[PDB]
UniProtKB/Swiss-Prot annotation, chain B:
The protein's assembly and partners: Component of the Mediator complex. Interacts with med18, prk1 and rbp1.
Family according to the record: Belongs to the Mediator complex subunit 17 family.
Functional note: Component of the Mediator complex, a coactivator involved in the regulated transcription of nearly all RNA polymerase II-dependent genes. Mediator functions as a bridge to convey information from gene-specific regulatory proteins to the basal RNA polymerase II transcription machinery. Mediator is recruited to promoters by direct interactions with regulatory proteins and serves as a scaffold for the assembly of a functional preinitiation complex with RNA polymerase II and the general transcription factors.
Coarse class of the protein's main subcellular location: nucleus
Keyword match Nucleus: yes
Entire-sequence positions represented here: 200 to 544 of 545
Organism field: Schizosaccharomyces pombe (strain 972 / ATCC 24843) (Fission yeast)
Localization of this protein: Nucleus
Protein name according to UniProt: Mediator of RNA polymerase II transcription subunit 17
GO MF: transcription coactivator activity; transcription coregulator activity
Swiss-Prot record, chain C:
Family recorded in the similarity comment: Belongs to the Mediator complex subunit 6 family.
Cellular localisation: Nucleus
Gene: med6
Name of the featured protein: Mediator of RNA polymerase II transcription subunit 6
Organism per entry: Schizosaccharomyces pombe (strain 972 / ATCC 24843) (Fission yeast)
Domain of life: Eukaryota
Role summary: Component of the Mediator complex, a coactivator involved in the regulated transcription of nearly all RNA polymerase II-dependent genes. Mediator functions as a bridge to convey information from gene-specific regulatory proteins to the basal RNA polymerase II transcription machinery. Mediator is recruited to promoters by direct interactions with regulatory proteins and serves as a scaffold for the assembly of a functional preinitiation complex with RNA polymerase II and the general transcription factors.
Subunit field text: Component of the Mediator complex.
Curated annotation (Swiss-Prot), chain E:
Designated name of the protein: Mediator of RNA polymerase II transcription subunit 18
Main location: nucleus
Entry keywords, A to Z: Activator, Nucleus, Transcription, Transcription regulation
MF GO annotations: transcription coactivator activity; transcription coregulator activity
Organism whose genome encodes this protein: Schizosaccharomyces pombe (strain 972 / ATCC 24843) (Fission yeast)
Single GO biological process annotation from the record: positive regulation of transcription initiation by RNA polymerase II
Family from the record: Belongs to the Mediator complex subunit 18 family.
InterPro entries, per the entry: Mediator_Med18
One Gene Ontology CC term in the entry: core mediator complex
Gene behind this protein: med18
Annotated function: Component of the Mediator complex, a coactivator involved in the regulated transcription of nearly all RNA polymerase II-dependent genes. Mediator functions as a bridge to convey information from gene-specific regulatory proteins to the basal RNA polymerase II transcription machinery. Mediator is recruited to promoters by direct interactions with regulatory proteins and serves as a scaffold for the assembly of a functional preinitiation complex with RNA polymerase II and the general transcription factors.
Quaternary assembly: Component of the Mediator complex. Interacts with med17, prk1 and rbp1.
Swiss-Prot record, chain F:
The keyword Transcription belongs to this UniProt entry's keyword annotation: yes
UniProt KW keywords: Activator, Nucleus, Transcription, Transcription regulation
GO CC annotations on file: mediator complex; nucleus
Gene from which the chain derives: med22
Residues annotated as signal peptide: none
Family as reported in the entry's similarity comment: Belongs to the Mediator complex subunit 22 family.
Species for this entry: Schizosaccharomyces pombe (strain 972 / ATCC 24843) (Fission yeast)
Top-level taxonomic group: Eukaryota
Name by which UniProt lists this protein: Mediator of RNA polymerase II transcription subunit 22
First-listed, main subcellular location of the protein, grouped into a coarse class: nucleus
Amino acid sequence: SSDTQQVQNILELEAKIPDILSSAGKCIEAIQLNNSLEDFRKYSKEFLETVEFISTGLRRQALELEKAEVPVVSLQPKKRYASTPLSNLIFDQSSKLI
Amino acid sequence: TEHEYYTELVKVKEASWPLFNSQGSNHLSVQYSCLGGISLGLGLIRMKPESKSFEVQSSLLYSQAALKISILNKDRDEIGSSTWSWPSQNCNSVLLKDIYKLQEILFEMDIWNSLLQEAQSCGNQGVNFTGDEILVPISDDHVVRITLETSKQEKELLKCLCDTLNAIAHILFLKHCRKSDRRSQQPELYMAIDANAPLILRPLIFYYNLNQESLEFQRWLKQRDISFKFMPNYPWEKAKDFLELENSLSINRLSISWRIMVSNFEPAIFIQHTPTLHGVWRCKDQYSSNQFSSLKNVCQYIEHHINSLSRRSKKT
Amino acid sequence: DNLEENKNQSIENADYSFSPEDFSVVRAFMQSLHSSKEAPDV
Amino acid sequence: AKYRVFIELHLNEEIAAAFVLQKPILPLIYNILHKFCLYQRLNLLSQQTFQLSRESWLGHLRGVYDEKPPRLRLYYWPQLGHYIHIFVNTQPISAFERTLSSKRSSCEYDHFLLLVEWHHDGIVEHVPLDDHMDAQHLLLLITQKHAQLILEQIRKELHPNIFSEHVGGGLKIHVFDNEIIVKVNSVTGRLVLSLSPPRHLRAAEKNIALNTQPPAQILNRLYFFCIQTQLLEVAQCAELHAVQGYYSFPYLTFSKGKWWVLAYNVESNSWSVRLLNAAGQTLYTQDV
Amino acid sequence: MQELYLLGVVPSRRFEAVVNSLSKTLDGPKTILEFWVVYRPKDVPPNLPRQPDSWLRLCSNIESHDETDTEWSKNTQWSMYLEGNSEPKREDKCGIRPVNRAKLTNGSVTEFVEKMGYEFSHEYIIQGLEYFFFDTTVRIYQTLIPSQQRSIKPPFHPMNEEQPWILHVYTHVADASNQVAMAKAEANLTKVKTLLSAFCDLKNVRL
Amino acid sequence: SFQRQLVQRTNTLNSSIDNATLTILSRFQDILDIAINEGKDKYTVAPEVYQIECHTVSMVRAVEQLLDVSRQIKSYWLTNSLSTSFPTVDYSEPDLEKVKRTLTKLQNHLLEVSLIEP
């Protein structure tokens, strides 16, 4: 778990959310089309975990966002003047011209 | 739509690039000039459903740009030619290629800012600019004109000169980036004009007037055929890396001895030559030392010897 | 056009940079033109 | 393509508006077609000024654009300021009004122009415009005329003794020239001794930046001093030490060696001898 | 020379991130190593100010100089400081104290404090990095105890197992009388304060 | 202080999250209260329909709020500083020798060099 990896973990969370719609619409459908209280007991029993796991997953990922201690405000960059790769790059072209 | 995007951002962040949020546009954006140079640069990663693959918007003018330099003739017909170039990249994605062309464009815009800005101060060496071009009057009626890109053996030799003029300007440019570190170099400031000039181009002129003058002098001696011993000692004669060669170009005095040979009996007249970059012909004979400026005075000074010493030959 | 959350964060100086500015002043073109067409009437 | 869309709309509205009211009919579109391309002409200029602010050439440029009918306010270098205005304008003339027409020749257009004011001169000259034109070139022509007026002014402030060509105040000193072209943008004339100039730079340009004294008395000092720079190089043979133990009057006082003391001199310029201590026998000659 | 100091504790637990941050938003880093010495006045009766800051502080860059040498104690470059107390009830805005950067060059260096009658007192080694910002500059502290008195042989002794890194923003006013220069300086430090407050908590501290 | 900033920010995030989830679950939960049919007056049924649709829209909206949070968090994970400057084409490390011979030769172009000597 580092840098981008948590973001990828968030990708795992991403698939779950939209379905929460149809699942609810599935639950009602059990008392609707299926006309069955028991199957509604089932899918309603399933439906809540989509809520709980995602909610707790967010609260915990955010807690990770605090543990990482990434600053609340983006830093203003200095006008970077001479990272080495830029230097030996330009030098490389210099020899390339020579 | 979602998974397509932030994964691309992962593709860039994996390549280690700064990232920053924008205004209400809400897209994350690349600090494409991470290697830096002078000015900051940013670019939003615009979504491109039309091409699926993302493309980066930027305020930059020309899609392509480089610091072209060229040699005008007496009729200003072009002879030499050059254009700045970059080594090829091997990106896993088109977008990163766009980032590299982007950064190189910002870079060249900044180097143009440099030569244009110096072009103000260095005009007292005779540098000129109409704004759209930069005149550099020199010997044999020529102008080393310079312009940013919009939107038999002599040709090879001059092409090598173009390589020098083009590359070294960038090297010195990087040296200026090093000088932006703000050590505040007091002693040269009074040797300097106004004020924190890049000094990216002045030495380049300096070695040229040096070359032309020493050349003219040697031709002055050859015209009457007289022996002499030129004794160079360039700062760049000694370097173990480009970092030292970088410092080889400086405001330092450049002494040059000139043990001219005249009499087959009387001693050679030492002729020190020390052109300071800013802020020159010191004769020294059998009689006494002298300090000139114009080379012609040096010539007539020799003429006093070819005259009066000949009269000394006539004394007995 | 027609007419011309807390996401305030951005780099300070920005410049040199880019940021839309998706559109500007183009409305002011024609509208200055019609405000001016009525000018002789005024 | 948005321009091909949004523009046609309102114009097609007004074409109907011609029939909603009195008949004009066509020319009303024509006028609207100009100020459009004229107003953009300001933006395409005004925005460029900002490019000359945030980028080169940095400061001394901040022409604010205005929300009213458009109004630029370019500024310049500090000097105890100075500004240009630019506007569209309407100037009907009879000379075409009757001599033309009755043909494929419009009566009223009417009307559109491009003002270019040139203040702090009292001239307010209406300099010609002719595309291509940029935010730069205006400023260039303006600095040219303005600074050249400063050149001719100082030329009036210069001594009669030192004649100068109209080319740019390029005053002579036998024989070497001292061109004094004014620096573009910020002043302090970029004079060129003649290639690469010696220390007089700091004595001049940087000293001119000091702002103290008129840019003339200093130049007078330069004309006074450079001749000495020549003669001292010519002073090497025959040690004309130019001892100042006599007097610092303009006539000058060379000495002699290797030995009351005679005092060879030059001033007019002409050959001259004035042994003195005191002030003894004197006489003049004119060779070469 | 009225210095405008600032202070900022850095836990060592998070110290590297601060470095990676500052390097990407400031000039430098430039390497910092130095060997303080204090030589104590010893005179009675008062009025001797005999203040804890009144004790003199000679300073000497030692980094470029090689560790193996033992005669560095005089051969090395040296300087002298006073650093008076910060002005009273100075909060919010940075504290301000007088400072005087003396220098000297002779084979006789340390001896002079005895020539003033001063004798050896407490001493400590500093290590860290400096960061330029035009005029203003920020240096980060580590007050390592030397392995031996006047010895330059590593390891040097930490005050504790987890020594805080002592961040220190400062700038050097040429003279107190110029409220204009004071304004430019307070402005620059204000901008620095804003610049790095995002990942650190600087504050004025009395001295 | 540096701490309370991230802390309170975390408080904002948790607040928006709990509010969104509670919103969804509440709007769904009250539909069952609205679910009753028989025994109601014919007029009383009518508002309840609109209430159903509005509760549903409220649910989908809070669902949008969740993604709105997700984008925030993603933005926070990309606003952090890079560990290092990025690698590039360091390949073909440039020679120093040719540069010297070229500069020294061109500077000595048409010139009769005569060694050095002390």
